[PDB]
Amino acid sequence: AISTHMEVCFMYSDFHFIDLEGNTIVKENMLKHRFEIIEGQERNIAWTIVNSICNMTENSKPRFLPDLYDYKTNKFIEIGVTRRKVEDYYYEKASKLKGENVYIHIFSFDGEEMATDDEYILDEESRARIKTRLFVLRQELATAGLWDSFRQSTLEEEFSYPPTFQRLANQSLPPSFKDYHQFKAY
Amino acid sequence: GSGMERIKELMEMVKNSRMREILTTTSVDHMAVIKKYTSGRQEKNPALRMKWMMAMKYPISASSRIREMIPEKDEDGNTLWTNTKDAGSNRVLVSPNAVTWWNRAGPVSDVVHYPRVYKMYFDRLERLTHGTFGPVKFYNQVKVRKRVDINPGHKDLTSREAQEVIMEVVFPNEVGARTLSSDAQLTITKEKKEELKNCKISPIMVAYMLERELVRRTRFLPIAGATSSTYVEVLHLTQGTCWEQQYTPGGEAENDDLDQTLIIASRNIVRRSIVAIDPLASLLSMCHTTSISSEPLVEILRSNPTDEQAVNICKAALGIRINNSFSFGGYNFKRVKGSSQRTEKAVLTGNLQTLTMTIFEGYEEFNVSGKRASAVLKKGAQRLIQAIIGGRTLEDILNLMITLMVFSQEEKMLKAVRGDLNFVNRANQRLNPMYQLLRHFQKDSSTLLKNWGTEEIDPIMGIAGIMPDGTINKTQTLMGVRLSQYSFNERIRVNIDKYLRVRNEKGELLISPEEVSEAQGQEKLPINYNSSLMWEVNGPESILTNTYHWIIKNWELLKTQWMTDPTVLYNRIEFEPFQTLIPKGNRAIYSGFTRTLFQQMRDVEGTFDSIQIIKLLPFSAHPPSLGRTQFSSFTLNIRGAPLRLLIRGNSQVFNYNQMENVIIVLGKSVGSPESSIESAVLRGFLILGKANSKYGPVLTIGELDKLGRGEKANVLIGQGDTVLVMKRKRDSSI
Amino acid sequence: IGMASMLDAMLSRARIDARIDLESGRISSQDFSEITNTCKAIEALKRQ
Amino acid sequence: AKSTDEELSYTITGDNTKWNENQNPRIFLAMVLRITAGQPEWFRDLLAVAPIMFSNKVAR
Amino acid sequence: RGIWKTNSETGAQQLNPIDGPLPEDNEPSGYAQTDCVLELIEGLDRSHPGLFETACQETIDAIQQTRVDKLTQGRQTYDWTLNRNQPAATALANTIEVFRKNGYKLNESGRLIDFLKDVLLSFENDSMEVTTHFGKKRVKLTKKNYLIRALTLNTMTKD
RNA sequence: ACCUCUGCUUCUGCU
RNA sequence: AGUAGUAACAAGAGG
Numbered sequence A: 001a002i003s004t005h006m007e008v009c010f011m012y013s014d015f016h017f018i019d020l021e022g023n024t025i026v027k028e029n030m031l032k033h034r035f036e037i038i039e040g041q042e043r044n045i046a047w048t049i050v051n052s053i054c055n056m057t058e059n060s061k062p063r064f065l066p067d068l069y070d071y072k073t074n075k076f077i078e079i080g081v082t083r084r085k086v087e088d089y090y091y092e093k094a095s096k097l098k099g100e101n102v103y104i105h106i107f108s109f110d111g112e113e114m115a116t117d118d119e120y121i122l123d124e125e126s127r128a129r130i131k132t133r134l135f136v137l138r139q140e141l142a143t144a145g146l147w148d149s150f151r152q153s154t155l156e157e158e159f160s161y162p163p164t165f166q167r168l169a170n171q172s173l174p175p176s177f178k179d180y181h182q183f184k185a186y
Numbered sequence B: 001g002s003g004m005e006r007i008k009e010l011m012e013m014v015k016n017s018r019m020r021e022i023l024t025t026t027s028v029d030h031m032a033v034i035k036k037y038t039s040g041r042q043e044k045n046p047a048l049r050m051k052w053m054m055a056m057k058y059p060i061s062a063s064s065r066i067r068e069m070i071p072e073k074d075e076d077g078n079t080l081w082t083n084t085k086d087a088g089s090n091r092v093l094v095s096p097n098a099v100t101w102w103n104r105a106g107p108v109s110d111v112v113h114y115p116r117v118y119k120m121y122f123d124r125l126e127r128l129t130h131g132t133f134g135p136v137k138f139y140n141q142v143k144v145r146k147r148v149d150i151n152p153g154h155k156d157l158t159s160r161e162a163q164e165v166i167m168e169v170v171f172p173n174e175v176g177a178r179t180l181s182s183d184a185q186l187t188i189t190k191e192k193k194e195e196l197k198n199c200k201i202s203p204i205m206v207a208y209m210l211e212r213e214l215v216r217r218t219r220f221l222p223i224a225g226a227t228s229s230t231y232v233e234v235l236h237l238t239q240g241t242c243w244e245q246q247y248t249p250g251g252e253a254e255n256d257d258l259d260q261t262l263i264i265a266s267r268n269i270v271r272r273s274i275v276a277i278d279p280l281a282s283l284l285s286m287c288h289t290t291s292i293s294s295e296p297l298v299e300i301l302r303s304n305p306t307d308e309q310a311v312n313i314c315k316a317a318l319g320i321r322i323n324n325s326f327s328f329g330g331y332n333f334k335r336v337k338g339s340s341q342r343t344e345k346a347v348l349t350g351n352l353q354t355l356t357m358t359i360f361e362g363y364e365e366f367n368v369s370g371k372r373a374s375a376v377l378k379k380g381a382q383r384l385i386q387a388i389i390g391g392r393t394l395e396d397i398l399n400l401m402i403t404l405m406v407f408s409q410e411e412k413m414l415k416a417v418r419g420d421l422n423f424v425n426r427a428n429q430r431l432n433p434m435y436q437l438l439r440h441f442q443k444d445s446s447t448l449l450k451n452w453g454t455e456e457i458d459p460i461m462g463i464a465g466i467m468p469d470g471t472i473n474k475t476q477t478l479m480g481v482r483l484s485q486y487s488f489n490e491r492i493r494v495n496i497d498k499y500l501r502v503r504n505e506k507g508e509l510l511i512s513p514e515e516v517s518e519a520q521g522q523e524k525l526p527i528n529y530n531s532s533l534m535w536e537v538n539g540p541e542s543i544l545t546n547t548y549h550w551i552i553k554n555w556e557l558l559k560t561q562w563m564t565d566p567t568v569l570y571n572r573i574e575f576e577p578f579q580t581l582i583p584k585g586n587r588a589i590y591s592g593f594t595r596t597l598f599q600q601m602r603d604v605e606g607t608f609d610s611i612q613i614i615k616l617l618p619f620s621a622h623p624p625s626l627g628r629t630q631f632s633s634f635t636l637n638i639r640g641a642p643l644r645l646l647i648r649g650n651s652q653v654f655n656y657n658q659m660e661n662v663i664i665v666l667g668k669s670v671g672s673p674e675s676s677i678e679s680a681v682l683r684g685f686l687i688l689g690k691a692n693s694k695y696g697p698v699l700t701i702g703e704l705d706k707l708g709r710g711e712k713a714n715v716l717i718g719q720g721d722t723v724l725v726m727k728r729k730r731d732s733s734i
Numbered sequence C: 001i002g003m004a005s006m007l008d009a010m011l012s013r014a015r016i017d018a019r020i021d022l023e024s025g026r027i028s029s030q031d032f033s034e035i036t037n038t039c040k041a042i043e044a045l046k047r048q
Numbered sequence D: 001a002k003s004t005d006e007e008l009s010y011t012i013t014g015d016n017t018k019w020n021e022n023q024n025p026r027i028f029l030a031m032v033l034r035i036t037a038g039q040p041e042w043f044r045d046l047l048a049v050a051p052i053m054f055s056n057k058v059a060r
Numbered sequence E: 001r002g003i004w005k006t007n008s009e010t011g012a013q014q015l016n017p018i019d020g021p022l023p024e025d026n027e028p029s030g031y032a033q034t035d036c037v038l039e040l041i042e043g044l045d046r047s048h049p050g051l052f053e054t055a056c057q058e059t060i061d062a063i064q065q066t067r068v069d070k071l072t073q074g075r076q077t078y079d080w081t082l083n084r085n086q087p088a089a090t091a092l093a094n095t096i097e098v099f100r101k102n103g104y105k106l107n108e109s110g111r112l113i114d115f116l117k118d119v120l121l122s123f124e125n126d127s128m129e130v131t132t133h134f135g136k137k138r139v140k141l142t143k144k145n146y147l148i149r150a151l152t153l154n155t156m157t158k159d
Numbered sequence F: 001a002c003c004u005c006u007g008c009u010u011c012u013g014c015u
Numbered sequence G: 001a002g003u004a005g006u007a008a009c010a011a012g013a014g015g
């Protein structure tokens, strides 16, 4: 799940730059990246990047860690991928992220999507690539017998004595007691 | 090249396999340990070690870069640096001549930010430069240990609020997830952020100083006078074992400190006045002579909006309009109708804790206003009958609700305290019951809210309801808690009689002096009563020591007067302050006991005892009243704890030390005056000497009445002693 | 705080610092590229 | 304050002989188990570790 | 006058005077009596209802929040990996490093309690490997050796 | 001989 | 010898 989510995110912004002018470009090989990839940064590092962006733009900081930020739209991106449906899932995500400016963009393995207000900030070409890859994954998930498995998916502190320490404990008691557990009960 | 030099350095390090291993295998978390990895030990005798090293040529460790920044040898041929690396680093060993060289001839930076970064320090000098000195006076005063504030100019933030703020100010991009709720936080941030832009002093020092400045710090110190932080800061200068150096620091007071001192002054004046023959005249005198830091108390009382019972008695006397209210939890409380009366009683909290606590019993009605919220409250004995509440936000209506639930004194809030809440500090000092509860339920009301309950509301819609959630709710609410939306602030003309009872124009009783809190607080700012009715040295301990010191030093005159003209002695005005230390209910009997005993000493010649006289004399100073009670001690209230002064011999409070030949009162010498028969211990009896089983079993004191003229006994007189007493054949009238 | 390596944190920080410096004008576009370049070379060198 | 006027009062200025040598890890174990009564067993057992180790200590 | 036993793990001779015979003179005694201690502690519980519970609660929170680096705050510390004293932080690092080389690394969480777990778990090891400097030699402690070092307090005189 | 290094570092604890 | 005082120093280590 996480592996795929990550790949999607990397795809969304790879070979997507901005000129010294300041216009969307796409290139294989002066430029500067178009998005900031936030997903897959360790939590603490990620918040630093968010903060640096928000302090630059004087925009409000989101309650949750987004997956991308776009230096052209000046928008934080959230991304999801679902072996389920594109709309029962979206509506859960928009709810969780209620009341903060975050462009959502679902994709399913079928190879169909659903942006917010069906306004796409990425070109069809680059969006096709992702829809392609999502299906091909469903295809190799099903051949191996995994795709059925995949699509379906506080504890109290523990502290106890391993054998040696247990034996030490048993020998650390007033003389009438045979073992640590008997002494603790008394 | 912002970022240029550091990434290039990083490149070079990663080219080394070792360094790369470290940087790839050490978590940020684990860096906290390896950061301290060292063979170097914390010097254990730094004084010796420095005396040793300062004999050496190159005792100082400096950055490698010193080698580029200063000459290797100075004009006199002193070597300033060497290429020897200090153990465990890339620092190099250098001479102290390098420091001097740098200070005479090195690079000159500009220091514009220094005052602002080190403001906490510079302010100290500012206060001193603009300080005023008065005279030094010499006297003994008890310096009682208490916790006091030590850093003027803090912003009253917790360490986590300070951290949050300092993170925003100094290292904004490293803040992490959450950001600042408080507006105090936000305006400090902007101010500081604006003061410290382009600042090139190390961020370590800036954070350090901000933390020192912004967080309230305290310490336990022996302190006789003003407890304000600006006075604490110069305690070494203003207070000695036998002296006070009168002093006023430069700068403004805190409004908080002034308000606090105004209350203490007003209470002191009221308590002193109540024991005068003409309270109102005495109160006015003191009001008109008193100052707080050289400001006349009269002017403060005219300009100061504090509503408090003693303050208001003073305002009334002076013809100043009052808002017949008090403060509690930041909200102002006007009593509309009804009344109640102060009674202390034991109280088990849900914390599981016994506690004496003054509890108001009776029917009362309160209009309540704060800056964001307001309410109407009806109250019984620990009864929240009803609270109608309004304000700007839900938040602000909530915060007042909490306050009112706590103010009720209800069992349900009493027995909703959870976790760590105690009524005595670490030093065993009693704390304010009600302020403790308030602070607790403002930290966390969840138990309180759940423990309270609910109520089904009617369709007279407009009388809305609030749920144990904190939620807005139409049909249900809490119990007694409702929501709704001219002259609450409006100050009225009152009148005041000779005994300080305050009434409106219609002539209803608004305030009586018996409603004034008995708490003896310590003033944040200096009070000078400048009054013949007050000891020059302030405070309860000082009433005790001053009075006894005064008796002793004037003993020759006072003795003759004890012999020739007692009643004039007893009525002297110098004994009135001391009267305020005696429980009201005991003054007359204590006086009657004392006068009787003193007459016995006169009648029974040869039994004069100057110490016994000095000791009991101040207790003579109230219209007497005879009784059957024998006293083994008199109670004195010092700082809300009773001390007992033993009638017979020495006590912790009052003792004559043979060895020094001094009288010691609360641990302080107050100087010295310089047969077996004791005439002035028991009413009606004489002590002859040591016990004698001849005259039968040892009786308590409270079993002596059942004797008769001339008849004797053995008595457990106190402090373990047994003595032979005789009932007197004639008794003394007084 | 973090489970990230010292190196990874420094790389992530250099990159995003260089980007803000660029927008805000504290740094040239040339400098900026060299920073992201140095970063990439560090990324690589970290694989032996 | 809590005393009656008829009571004598004495103070011992007090010190103990070889305090540390006569303290006992087994007793500390008892104290820790009793103080932590009713608490989660992981925490009781965690806190009991120090006394147990002291019962089994050696001195270089 | 107490009871001697041989420790199963270290072979140490261990004297136990608890619930031993009552003192018979005024000489210093270690014959503390469990039931008497318990009576006293119960007395303290009864005098201060809720005190034990609160102090426990705070201690639990502390156990959850404390970072491993808290142990850097000590002074000279016996360092079993060297059989010599070292600054506390250096001693901590050495333990962590040798632990991880021998397969104990719950402490990577950064939580003190996880380091405590590693400690107890380290006693199950057949032979803890450390390195001495002759250049560099790997030395294997016996299970017994290791446990003895773990249970060691180094000693010196008070100046 | 003479050379080199070292001057708290095999030894300074605990709330 | 001297310092010291329940055990040390009166140089140590290495070449």
Ligand SMILES: CN1CN([C@@H]2O[C@H](COP(=O)(O)OP(=O)(O)OP(=O)(O)O)[C@@H](O)[C@H]2O)c2nc(N)[nH]c(=O)c21
Binding pocket: B309, B326, B327, B328, B335, B340, B360, B364, B379, B407, B408, B409, B432, B434, B435, B517, B518, B519, B521
């Ligand atoms: C619950 N309360 C509290 N209270 C008033 O609350 C005011 C301040 O609260 P407090 O806790 O008594 O503080 P106070 O004694 O002034 O503080 P200090 O320790 O400085 O003396 C007092 O003036 C007191 O009269 C009340 N007054 C009336 N009439 N009825 C009540 O039910 C209550």
Ligand SMILES: Nc1ccn([C@@H]2O[C@H](COP(=O)(O)OP(=O)(O)OP(=O)(O)O)[C@@H](O)[C@H]2O)c(=O)n1
Binding pocket: D015, D016, D017, D018, D019, D020, D021, E158, F014
């Ligand atoms: N420098 C010190 C001094 C004392 N203590 C602790 O304080 C206790 C009491 O110290 P002291 O009365 O000086 O010694 P005792 O061990 O009681 O021995 P004695 O009084 O018989 O000399 C010690 O046992 C020890 O736990 C300590 O840890 N460090």
Ligand SMILES: [Mg+2]
Binding pocket: D015, D016, D017, D018, D019
């Ligand atoms: Mg002792």
